[PDB]
Each structure stands twice: as structure tokens, then as C-alpha cells.
Design an enzyme around this catalytic site. Structure first.
Site, PDB file in Angstrom:
ATOM      1  CD  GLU A 132      -3.260   0.884   1.949  1.00  0.00           C
ATOM      2  OE1 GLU A 132      -4.421   1.094   1.636  1.00  0.00           O
ATOM      3  OE2 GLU A 132      -2.744   0.445   3.152  1.00  0.00           O
ATOM      4  CD  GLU A 307      -3.765  -3.007  10.460  1.00  0.00           C
ATOM      5  OE1 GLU A 307      -3.947  -3.212   9.328  1.00  0.00           O
ATOM      6  OE2 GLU A 307      -3.774  -1.973  10.849  1.00  0.00           O
ATOM      7  CG  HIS A 310      -8.240  -2.780   7.183  1.00  0.00           C
ATOM      8  ND1 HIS A 310      -8.840  -1.853   6.377  1.00  0.00           N
ATOM      9  CD2 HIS A 310      -7.055  -2.096   8.077  1.00  0.00           C
ATOM     10  CE1 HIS A 310      -8.224  -0.606   6.879  1.00  0.00           C
ATOM     11  NE2 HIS A 310      -7.239  -0.713   7.490  1.00  0.00           N
TER      12      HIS A 310
HETATM   13 ZN   LIG Z   1      -5.952   0.621   8.439  1.00  0.00          ZN
END
Ligand SMILES: [Zn+2]
Length: 860
Positions: A132, A307, A310
């Protein structure tokens, strides 16, 4: 020449033309355990993809040292002019396509792409990936954009002592020549930025989340460097992990979508954590080799659940383009706290959220760069600086408010619609709204328009009138126009709390609570008519909405005189937050904030505050108030008061407690006098200990850094400490200490290395920057105001956005609060500069303007 700056329109053009089925990636890491000179690894990619228009041309992305071959539908392509900015052109596409590319990609030490680190302790070589935003192209050839999802089949040849972790489970065989071949299962479809590779001689722990309620068993792994393994609290981490996996599938109605879940603590990481599907990476600071307070445990647990969240918000369903990054980060942030409160020991996490994360949201939203949650992102460069307090914390706060408004049952039912509909695909703002509208049966277009598409905050404050018995005769909530922004008045679902003395304890307790929809300029609260007004009214009681809460005069006098007497932690923290924001906004004098915080007895001020995370945050805010917001004439006196009170608090604190440690750590960041320096030296050397304070490896560095900063210790003591802590962490902490040396020579060496030395790894360059500023050293740093503005363009040109940001943000002359600094910034702003750089410089200027107004307010 640099990797590409992919535009929104370019991405749309590729997505309209292409559909990618699969990647098969083969990495040759056989040479990876060699020395510091090993530069490249072999990267072979086979990509299978469709074109809607046979005969059209497109391009695929790759950042490599060399392209050996590229062959499209069996035709060899000319790569003689390859460079990383243009990737590989793909002419004469067919309806169905296969491209095979053999390249030599580069390891980095920048925390981008495939990062390589060598442990000085044992010579172990550790790799991890970070893709990312758009750094997948540094490991394999790909259409590096989030809406061209595909499956991945990853095979890696590695040194035989390495473990290898990726998104999916795999099988490992010996090659017969000192390496092992790791063949990973084909993944479920996902975006390129979520592909993972972690490889090295990592320590390993295994556990399993048992199959429950339609969710299959989940194998669990934890990984860290071998040299850190004795410090990893695996049992505790697996407990917290399993609490999350029980919670989220119940809440969302959707089982964990990937097969297994590995969590890897990795060296030299740039962020807190990263949600690679099935293979989450974490900052090593979360491996606690020294004793930390309960706040760090809570913040680590938050990160773990962020996390995990996500896995649904980002990995299962992904934003179509980067303008909807908030679909990932706002929802993951909101859901992390929902999980903490619902499933873990951290039942206080909404208090932490109000105190810590909302303060970040406010600050972000008030900068000249302010943008809506649903942002406008023209290109990759714009998103690289948009992982910010709006994308995260304001978005999370707006969502919390949307939950309050529609109700949690309707919101969760909406998430189930959304996940089921968009699974293995992409979504936008519109898609999310339609799902929520379907579940709730409500129109939310107007709601989105005022809340997700706007900037700024509404002030909310009570307007009241009382009779001679103290009972309200009228009560309204006034709403100010949204600022900075368009000036709209929003609908808020909020509660008003009335607090008065509990006869038994004398503490302030909630007597009444009225919840309602507030709209427009004024909203009457008729159910409060007749109620006794008590001593404190809070119009965002329970922290349901996103606003600037303010108090009526009597209530504010109660806060000032009696904040510690508030019984419950949440309204007390809202009161600490109000006082802080009033200081930031030139409504409360800095010296008044400092006095509130310092108190005057054991039961007043922050020393009386039970919530350790609020104590730490409020102390950091006080240090900002002193350096930035107080009248310069009063700053020295304010620091003496602060240092003196913090030494008293440290000496009064329960031995071994989190409070004791927080006070010491706050002293270690402060402007100190001789009395505190000498105390601190006696703690460090242990000749005059503070009872129960264990000065362990990292506290020794924190105290030594404070001594260095004050000229009470020097290079020889730093070098001696580095000998006691001969580790990669020690090298970093020694670097911070060397930047703190208060001489012109030292500061110039630190500046030169931070700005120019591109051989140093990310974490070292960053540690150098982290010691450059100190509140006692303003006169040394004043020699760098013009240096910064004159040199930052060249930094921005040379380094990636992600690697230039620490210099741009961290060396900005925030210490030089003067109209002269504003004038220098103004002249720089009249020039031509990269938009993202301009954004960051304007943010720094805005800091100076806000501090000047605060200083004038404090002047007495
Ligand atoms: Zn995040």
C-alpha cells in the site's frame, strides 16, 4: 525518474479495457541471505487477463533493475527502453492474454516493496513486503490499481533456514541445493496492494481459532525476529486475536474470508500495521522488550483489531479508487473500537477514542488542507498524503454518529447487505449508502451530503435559563455553522447530560440524560424544562456526535474548579478534551490549561486522573501548550512549574505503577532544571533510585536522551549505552540521542544526514529526525528556518513521497512561532511546488498561525 504517478483517469481507462484473472509469481530469493551488498532478486510473473477491445494497447507496471524478457501471447516485446516510470507497453492486445515477464527487482531499505534487513545480533536476514499504496510493482509485474482484482499463486525459492509467510497456506520442499521451495495455494481474489511476502528466520508461534457459528476453524500464527522472541507475549496476543474473530463474524454476519491468519512483527516498518490478507504486518515497537503502561497494550489491541477489521473493510470489499480509501480506514477504525468494547478487556476504549483519536480528527479538519471524508484524489501523489486524521479519525467519528442516528441494528444489517453484494469486488461511497438505505428503509443522500461530503466542525453549546430554584425554564442546543468549510448546520443525534454532586461522595454524577435529533441553528429540549441544572451540562454526553462541544458559563467554571471530581471516565475525558480544544482555539489561556492539568493537591489535576491513556495524552498536550501556545515571556516559568510538579508527582506515585512510569516519561520529554536533571541521573545510574521504578533497557535510553538534550551527558555516554544495548533498536535510540546533542556542530551533522544520506535505512533516518527537535533547544533550531524552506523541494524531488514525508513534516520549523516564519512560508507559497508538498508546507504554516493567536490570547 521514479515509479509512476497513476492518475484517476488512467486507472479508469485501464479498468474499462481490462479484466485480470490471475497472477502466478515466482521469486528467486536464493541469494537473499548473503551480505549487505546483495541488491536484487529474481521476479517472474505470468499474468492472465482479458481485453474488451482486441487490437488496443495498454501498459502494465513494474519497478525493476532489469527486464530480462517480456513476452505477450508468445510474442517477444522490445523492452530496450524500459524504465520504471513507464512500465511495459502492451500493444495489439487479444481478447484473452497471457504475459510472462522475467525481471530482477531490487530489495529496499525504505520499507517500500520488498524490504531487506540484517540483524546485527545474529546475522539473521529478514524480508517483508509493503505494497500500500502502489509498491506492489516493486516485487512483481502488475496492473497496480485496486480495482483490477485477481487471484495470486506465489512460489518462492529461499534459503533453507528461512520461514516464508504469504497470503495463503503453502507446501514446502527441499531443492537439494541449500534452499527450499515454498509453493503457496492460489489466493482468493484481491487487490495488488494486499499481496504479502514475509521471509526470514522468524520465531514462530501457532494456535487455532476453533470453528464456531458457521465460521470454520482459523489457523493462527505469530512471527517475530528470533532475537526479539523472548519478549513476545504470544498467549496474550492470541487471546485478543480470538476475541476479535468471535466478534466480527457475529457483528457482520460474514465469516472471516481468508483461510488462515498470520501476524508478523517486522523490522524497520514505516506505519503501525498493514492488513495484507492473511498475513498482517506490524511495527516492532509492539513487541514490548521493556515495560510499558496499560495504554500501549490498549493501543496494540486496537491495532490488532483494526487490521482484523480490514479483512472485511478493505480486503473482501475494496474501494474502487483511492478517493474512497475512507471505506477501508474509517470503518476499520470504528469497528476496532466497537470490538474492543464488545469483546475485550478494553471496555473503556470509547473514552480513549474521545481523548486521543478525536483530537487528531479536529486538528486535521481545521487545517487549510481540510477535505471531506469522501475525498477527491486526482492521482497517487494525492493519496500518499491522505492517510490522515480525516480519513481515519474523523471518518470513524462520523460513522459512530451514523450508527447513533440509524441505530446499530440497522447499521450492521446494512454492512451485511454491503459485504454480500460487493464481496471479492470494489465499492464506492454510493454503494455503501445504498446498502445502508436498504437495511434502514431510510433516504441517506441528504445525510451523506452534509456529513461525508463536507469539511469542518459545528460548535454545539447549551443556551439555558433557570428559575430561582435552579430549574431550567428554557433549554436549547445552539449549533454553529460548519468551519472551516461551507457553513452548513447538520443533523446530530446527541445526548445532553446533567451532572450534580452525589451526596455520599461529593463527586459529580449524572442526574439526567436526554437524547434527541438536533438540527439547524437551534433545537429546543423541552424534556429538560423543570429539571434542576446541577453543576455541569454536557451537550455531547456519551460522545455520540462529531462536534466542538462548549459549555455554559457555570458549567465551564465547574470544569475549571472540579474536573477531577467527575465520577465517570468518559464525561471527564470529554471535559479534558474541551479544555484542550479551547486552548488550541484561543478560548482558554495556555497558562490556564497548564494550571488545570498541574492541579494543586493529590486530588486535583491530571495526577488524580485514573485513566492512564488520558494522563499520557493530556501531558503531551500540556507540553505543546507550553512550547507553542504560551506567551514567550511566561514559557520559562511555565516549564519550571511543569518540571517541578512532574518530579513531585513521580516521587508521590505508587511504586512500580503505570502512573509513576508515565510521570517519568513525561519528565524525559520536558524542559528540565538542575534539580530534575540530577534526580534523573540518579535514577539512570541507580545510585539514587526512584522506589519501584525499574530502569530497563528502553527507559535507560529515554532518561539518557533527556540528559543529552540538556548537556548533562554526551557522545561518550551514548557510545557506552550503545555497548550495553548492541541491537538494531539500540542503534536507533543512540541515533535519536546523537541528534539531541545541543551544539551547532551536532545539529548540522544531524540535519545533513537526515536530509541527504539516502544509504541509511528508513528507521535510522527517521530516528535522526526524531531527535532534532526538543523544547529546550529552540535557539539552536532557529538556524534552520530558512534552511528548511530553501531545501525541501530538492528532498521532495529525490525521495519518494512516503520517504520524504518524515523530513517535510518533522523538520518543518514549528518551533519558530513568529510572524517572520509565516512571511517566509508565504514567499515559498508564491513559488511553484509539487501539490502534495505544498499541502504539507501549508499545514506547517497553519500551525504557526494558530500558535500566534494562542500566544496573544495567553498574554496577560
Ligand atoms: Zn487501516
Amino acid at each position: 525518474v521514479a515509479p509512476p504517478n497513476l492518475t484517476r483517469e488512467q486507472a479508469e481507462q485501464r479498468a474499462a479495457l481490462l479484466e485480470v484473472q490471475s497472477y502466478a509469481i515466482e521469486l528467486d530469493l536464493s541469494a537473499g541471505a548473503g551480505g549487505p551488498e546483495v541488491e536484487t532478486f529474481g521476479s517472474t510473473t505470468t499474468v492472465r487477463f482479458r481485453s474488451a477491445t482486441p487490437g488496443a494497447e495498454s501498459w502494465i507496471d513494474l519497478v525493476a533493475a532489469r527486464v530480462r524478457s517480456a513476452v505477450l501471447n508468445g510474442v517477444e516485446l522490445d523492452v530496450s527502453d524500459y524504465d520504471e516510470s513507464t512500465g511495459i507497453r502492451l500493444p495489439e492486445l487479444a481478447a484473452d492474454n497471457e504475459l510472462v515477464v522475467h525481471a530482477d527487482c531490487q530489495y529496499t531499505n525504505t520499507g517500500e516493496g520488498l524490504h531487506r534487513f540484517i540483524d546485527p545480533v545474529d546475522g539473521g536476514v529478514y524480508l517483508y513486503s509493503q505494497f500500500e499504496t502502489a509498491d506492489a510493482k516493486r516485487m512483481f509485474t502488475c496492473f497496480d490499481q485496486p480495482d483490477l482484482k485477481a487471484t495470486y499463486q506465489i512460489t518462492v525459492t529461499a534459503p533453507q533456514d528461512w520461514k516464508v509467510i504469504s497470503n495463503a497456506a503453502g507446501e514446502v520442499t527441499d531443492t537439494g541445493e541449500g534452499t527450499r521451495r515454498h509453493v503457496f495455494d492460489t489466493t482468493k481474489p484481491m487487490s495488488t496492494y494486499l499481496v504479502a511476502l514475509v521471509a526470514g528466520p522468524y520465531a514462530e508461534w501457532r494456535d487455532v481459532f476453533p470453528g464456531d457459528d458457521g465460521q470454520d476453524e482459523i489457523p493462527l500464527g505469530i512471527y517475530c525476529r528470533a532475537s526479539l522472541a523472548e519478549h513476545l507475549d504470544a498467549e496474550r496476543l492470541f487471546i485478543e486475536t480470538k476475541q476479535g474473530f468471535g466478534f466480527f463474524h457475529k457483528a457482520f454476519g460474514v465469516p472471516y474470508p481468508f483461510g488462515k491468519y498470520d501476524q508478523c512483527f517486522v523490522p524497520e516498518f514505516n506505519a503501525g500495521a498493514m492488513e495484507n490478507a492473511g498475513c498482517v504486518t506490524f511495527l516492532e515497537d509492539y513487541v514490548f522488550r521493556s515495560r510499558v503502561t496499560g495504554y500501549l497494550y490498549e493501543r496494540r489491541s486496537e491495532t490488532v483489531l483494526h487490521e482484523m477489521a480490514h479483512m472485511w473493510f478493505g480486503d473482501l470489499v475494496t474501494m474502487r479508487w483511492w478517493d474512497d480509501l475512507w471505506l477501508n480506514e474509517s470503518f476499520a477504525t470504528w469497528a476496532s473500537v466497537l470490538a474492543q468494547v464488545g469483546a475485550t478487556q478494553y471496555t473503556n476504549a470509547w473514552t480513549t477514542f474521545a481523548s486521543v483519536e478525536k483530537s487528531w480528527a479536529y486538528r486535521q479538519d481545521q487545517l487549510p488542507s481540510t477535505h471531506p471524508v469522501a475525498a477527491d484524489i486526482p492521482d497517487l501523489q494525492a493519496v500518499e498524503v491522505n492517510f490522515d486524521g480525516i480519513t481515519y479519525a474523523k471518518g470513524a467519528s462520523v460513522l459512530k454518529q451514523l450508527v447513533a442516528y440509524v441505530g446499530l441494528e440497522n447499521f450492521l444489517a446494512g454492512l451485511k447487505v454491503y459485504f454480500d453484494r460487493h464481496a471479492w469486488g470494489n465499492a464506492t461511497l454510493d454503494d455503501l449508502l445504498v446498502a445502508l438505505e436498504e437495511a434502514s428503509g431510510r433516504d441517506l443522500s441528504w445525510w451523506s451530503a452534509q456529513w461525508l461530503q463536507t469539511t469542518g466542525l459545528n460548535m454545539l453549546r447549551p443556551k439555558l435559563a433557570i428559575d430561582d430554584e435552579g430549574r431550567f425554564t428554557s433549554f436549547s442546543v445552539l449549533q454553529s455553522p460548519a468551519r472551516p468549510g461551507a457553513g452548513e448546520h447538520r443533523t446530530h443525534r446527541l445526548a445532553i447530560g446533567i451532572y450534580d454532586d452525589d451526596p455520599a461522595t461529593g463527586e459529580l454524577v449524572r442526574t439526567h440524560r436526554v437524547e434527541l435529533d438536533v438540527t439547524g441553528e437551534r433545537t429546543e429540549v423541552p424534556d429538560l424544562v423543570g429539571v434542576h441544572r446541577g453543576k455541569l451540562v454536557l451537550v455531547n454526553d456519551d460522545d455520540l456526535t462529531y462536534c466542538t462541544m462548549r459549555l455554559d458559563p457555570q458549567s465551564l467554571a465547574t470544569l475549571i474548579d472540579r474536573i477531577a471530581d467527575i465520577q465517570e471516565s468518559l464525561p471527564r475525558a470529554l471535559c479534558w478534551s474541551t479544555a484542550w480544544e479551547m486552548t488550541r482555539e484561543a478560548e482558554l489561556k495556555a497558562r490556564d490549561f497548564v494550571s488545570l492539568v498541574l492541579g494543586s493537591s493529590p486530588t486535583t489535576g491530571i495526577g488524580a486522573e485514573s485513566e492512564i491513556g488520558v494522563v499520557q495524552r493530556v501531558l503531551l498536550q500540556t507540553q505543546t501548550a507550553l512550547a507553542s501556545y504560551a506567551d514567550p515571556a511566561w514559557q520559562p516559568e511555565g516549564w519550571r512549574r511543569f518540571a517541578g510538579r512532574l518530579l513531585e508527582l513521580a516521587r508521590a506515585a505508587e511504586p512500580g505503577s503505570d502512573h509513576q512510569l508515565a510521570f517519568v516519561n513525561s519528565l524525559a520529554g520536558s524542559v528540565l532544571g538542575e534539580e530534575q536533571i540530577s534526580a534523573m541521573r540518579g535514577w539512570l545510574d541507580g545510585t539514587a533510585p526512584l522506589e519501584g521504578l525499574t530502569v530497563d533497557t528502553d527507559l535507560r535510553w529515554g532518561l539518557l536522551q533527556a540528559l543529552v538534550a540538556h548537556g548533562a551527558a554526551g557522545e561518550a555516554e551514548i557510545d557506552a549505552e550503545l555497548e550495553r544495548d548492541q541491537t538494531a533498536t539500540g542503534r536507533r535510540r543512540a541515533e535519536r540521542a546523537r541528534s539531541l546533542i545541543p551544539t551547532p556542530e551536532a545539529k548540522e551533522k544531524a540535519w545533513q544526514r537526515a536530509v541527504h544520506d539516502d544509504q541509511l535505512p528508513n528507521a535510522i533516518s527517521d530516528a535522526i529526525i526524531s531527535g532534532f527537535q526538543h523544547p529546550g533547544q529552540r535557539e539552536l533550531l532557529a538556524s534552520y528556518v530558512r534552511r528548511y524552506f530553501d531545501e525541501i523541494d530538492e528532498v521532495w524531488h529525490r525521495r519518494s513521497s512516503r520517504r520524504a514525508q518524515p523530513t517535510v513534516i518533522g523538520l518543518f520549523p514549528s518551533w519558530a512561532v513568529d510572524e517572520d516564519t509565516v512571511a517566509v512560508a508565504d514567499r515559498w507559497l508564491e513559488g511553484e511546488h509539487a501539490p502534495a508538498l505544498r499541502r504539507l508546507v501549508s499545514e506547517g504554516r497553519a500551525g504557526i498561525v494558530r500558535a500566534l493567536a494562542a500566544r496573544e490570547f495567553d498574554r496577560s
